[PDB]
Amino acid sequence: SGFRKMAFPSGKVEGCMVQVTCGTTTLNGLWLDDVVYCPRHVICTSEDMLNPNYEDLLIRKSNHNFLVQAGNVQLRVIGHSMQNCVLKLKVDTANPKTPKYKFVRIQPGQTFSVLACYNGSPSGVYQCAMRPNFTIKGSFLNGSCGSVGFNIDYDCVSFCYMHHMELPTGVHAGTDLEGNFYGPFVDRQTAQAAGTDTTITVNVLAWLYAAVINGDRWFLNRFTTTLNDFNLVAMKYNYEPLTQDHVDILGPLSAQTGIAVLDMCASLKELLQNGMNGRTILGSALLEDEFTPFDVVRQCSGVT
Amino acid sequence: SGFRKMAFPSGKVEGCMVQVTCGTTTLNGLWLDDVVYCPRHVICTSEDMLNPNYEDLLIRKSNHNFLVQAGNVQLRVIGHSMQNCVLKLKVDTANPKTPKYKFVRIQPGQTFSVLACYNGSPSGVYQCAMRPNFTIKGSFLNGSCGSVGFNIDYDCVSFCYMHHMELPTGVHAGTDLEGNFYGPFVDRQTAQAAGTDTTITVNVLAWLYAAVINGDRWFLNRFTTTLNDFNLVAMKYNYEPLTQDHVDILGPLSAQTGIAVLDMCASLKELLQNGMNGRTILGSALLEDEFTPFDVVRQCSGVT
Ligand SMILES: *CC(=O)N1CCC(C(=O)N2CCCCC2)CC1
Ligand SMILES: *CC(=O)N1CCC(C(=O)N2CCCCC2)CC1
Incomplete structure (x- = not known):
């Protein structure tokens, strides 16, 4: 646990x-x-x-x-x-x-590990998500450019990110390993503002599943909802719209916990409308959105 | 940033x-x-x-x-x-x-990285603190025992922790590499309850410094306090008593930011008495206590 x-x-x-x-x-x-x-x-x-x-x-x-x-x-x-x-x-x-390695262009909501480096010497490793606004919330000082973001599938590293830019708002921009920026960003010292930093709804749900699986259950309620009803509440709270694809992706976690995805959506809806009331979920006071469904399954199962 | x-x-x-x-x-x-x-x-x-x-x-x-x-x-x-x-x-x-390696017995409040392993294969790496109750809040499934906690000083790994026990409350217990348990814990399936999980006050302050250094400043106020006055507020909120040693340890961060430690204590006091009011500090809704002063200096400077 x-x-x-x-x-x-x-x-x-x-x-x-x-x-x-x-x-x-x-x-x-x-x-x-x-x-x-x-x-x-x-x-x-x-x-x-x-x-x-x-x-x-x-x-x-x-x-x-x-x-x-x-x-x-x-x-x-x-x-x-x-x-x-x-x-x-x-x-x-x-x-x-x-x-063994691949270069992959990740989508917004996909997570990856960053090895922070200075002068080609690794300083630390943390977990990121590509934000819906194509920023990442990193830790990058001068000399940290060229630090990469990656996923490992057993023995094959999939490189998704190279660090290039700090925006005046202290968020981060960079490229895949073909050198194409995530989002509209350019390697140029100019007025680049990030768009709305929306919450990755599917990730919050995955994390709500991880919580139940590890005993944190207070936020389970008697309610259910529909995609359309839940998405009205998502809109108001700058959450990514939830798609049937996302529901499908949460299937395994649904299965294992025996909580329907739409019931967990109704749990997330009440958390959005009512806040945490000073309580925590997996030692967080806000709704974590940088765990994928895949990340939850991995960590809850113990893949190496 | x-x-x-x-x-x-x-x-x-x-x-x-x-x-x-x-x-x-x-x-x-x-x-x-x-x-x-x-x-x-x-x-x-x-x-x-x-x-x-x-x-x-x-x-x-x-x-x-x-x-x-x-x-x-x-x-x-x-x-x-x-x-x-x-x-x-x-x-x-x-x-x-x-x-190059050492075996070191860390103190409560000291932080370390854990390489989660299964069948001698690394699955992931996360950052921990030895809690004041000598537990750690880890991620450990069956087969994860023997996973170690460590610090690196450039090329020298200081091993501080081996994973042994999950407590019924889903917190974690283990040994230094001389096999001595942190705290009163035993490698025996018995009634072992963790004591009060107190907040590492010095770490919260370090993290309040890291925040200012990265532009998150809303919680700075006009107030100061004394150690004795701050410690009355710490007691009430199950925070570690703050010692002159801790003040001394925060000196460098005091220096760099030009915020007196006792002013930052007064900032922490108001945060304790008033909560966050739905605001965040470095993208957290609660007061993080698993960054040491050393950790803040390291990450804010860029040591490898
Ligand atoms: C992110 C990174 O490591 N960079 C390299 C240093 C660079 C910089 O500081 N300057 C100042 C001197 C002239 C070149 C740009 C910023 C990007
Ligand atoms: C933490 C860890 O990896 N452990 C090894 C497995 C062990 C366990 O599950 N059992 C059940 C079978 C008899 C031995 C104990 C728990 C500790």
């Missing part, structure tokens, strides 16, 4: 972190096979900043301007290309610690 | 996790040099359970009854001894991945 916000073991990804220095800029790169991936803004300076023309900036860069260091050993850069907002530095040595 | 509940990178510790099987019991061991550490209850059965005499139970065990498996390779057990509530299995091979 016990339910905890749990990151994947970072080992496989620690073995992929290098330092990338271009000029006076130092940040993090991912080393997979003979390619190192980093944010293209590594090449930026004091001024370019507001409106860097990355293609033009890059013309002034050679292979030898990209200093790539794996612990205390330098990697030889034998090629460099720009793919969207990431650089791909070809090194002459394949990372011997390259795990 | 952003502040997140952050575990240490698990890599160094993943490389230390093996499976220990005695009879039909499978749980986790720590492999450091040529010794594997596991809970002594690995040798327990259906009945012993309520009052196992571990010395007597162990007489019926030989080296060859302890099956130790590192991934898909078996380790040869060449000796076994009981140290308090852990077993130390001598293997014929030193773990090639043994990091």
Whole structure:
């Protein structure tokens, strides 16, 4: 028993972190096979900043301007290309610690672990969600750019995120490993405001299931609801609309706990309309929305 | 910016996790040099359970009854001894991945990362505190015993915790790596109730500092207080008494933010007396107490 916000073991990804220095800029790169991936803004300076023309900036860069260091050993850069907002530095040595890996573009509501790094050295690991507004609520200081977000399926790391941008509101933006930003965000120091940070309804329900499974049951009530009725209450409270797909996704948790999804929706509805009344659910005073149904099943079953 | 509940990178510790099987019991061991550490209850059965005499139970065990498996390779057990509530299995091979390590007995309020494992395979990593009642609020299913809690100081892992017991209230108990339980707890299926789960006052303050440092400032007020006045309010709310040592420990954070510790105490006092009024601090609706002052400094500075 016990339910905890749990990151994947970072080992496989620690073995992929290098330092990338271009000029006076130092940040993090991912080393997979003979390619190192980093944010293209590594090449930026004091001024370019507001409106860097990355293609033009890059013309002034050679292979030898990209200093790539794996612990205390330098990697030889034998090629460099720009793919969207990431650089791909070809090194002459394949990372011997390259795990099985995929690059996946996650959807909003999907969760992942982030290995926070500075100078290609891992500092910590935490669990995130891609927010419905395509931000993430991270922990990222200067030098943390190139830190990646990932999922592990047993021995295969699925990289979903590279850190690029802090918004003036102190939320975070970045790319998949093809260098495409999540959401409308750009690697440019400009007026970028996040949209509404909506709650991931399906995740709150998953977490309501995890709670029951671990003995926290006070919020179970006698009520049920429909999708349409529940979604009126979701709207008012800036919750993602709940779809039959979401109900379907909660099936297993429904099954195991013998609580119908729509009954749990009615439990969530009362929590929204009435608050927690100073009580807690799995040691939280608000409705957690960064556990997927998959995350709950994983942690409640004990998958490795 | 952003502040997140952050575990240490698990890599160094993943490389230390093996499976220990005695009879039909499978749980986790720590492999450091040529010794594997596991809970002594690995040798327990259906009945012993309520009052196992571990010395007597162990007489019926030989080296060859302890099956130790590192991934898909078996380790040869060449000796076994009981140290308090852990077993130390001598293997014929030193773990090639043994990091620099220490065994440290932590104090209540001290935080650590736990690598949740099943069958010597890491499932996840989360951050814990040793509670003032010597419990931890973990996530531990069957097979998770022998999972360890640790801190890293750069390249040196300080192991502080091995998982042994779930209390009927679904909180967790275990030992340091010398096999001594934190608190009054025993590896025996009996009436063990946790005492009052008090809040780690110094940690809440550290976290109040982390908040200010990351822009969450609404709870700053015009008030100050004394230790004695603040401690009357702490008592009433089951908070650890705050000592000058704690004030001293918060010095650096005081310095950096230019908020006197006693002013922040007065901020915490009003939060206790008035609640959050439906507001949040670093995306929490209650007062987080599993960040040390050291943890705040680390994450706010970016130590690796
Ligand atoms: C997120 C990260 O690590 N970054 C690298 C540093 C960079 C920065 O601070 N500057 C200032 C000096 C000129 C380049 C940009 C911000 C992004
Ligand atoms: C915490 C852990 O992993 N443990 C190992 C399993 C054990 C258990 O379930 N049993 C039942 C069968 C007889 C031995 C005890 C509990 C501790």
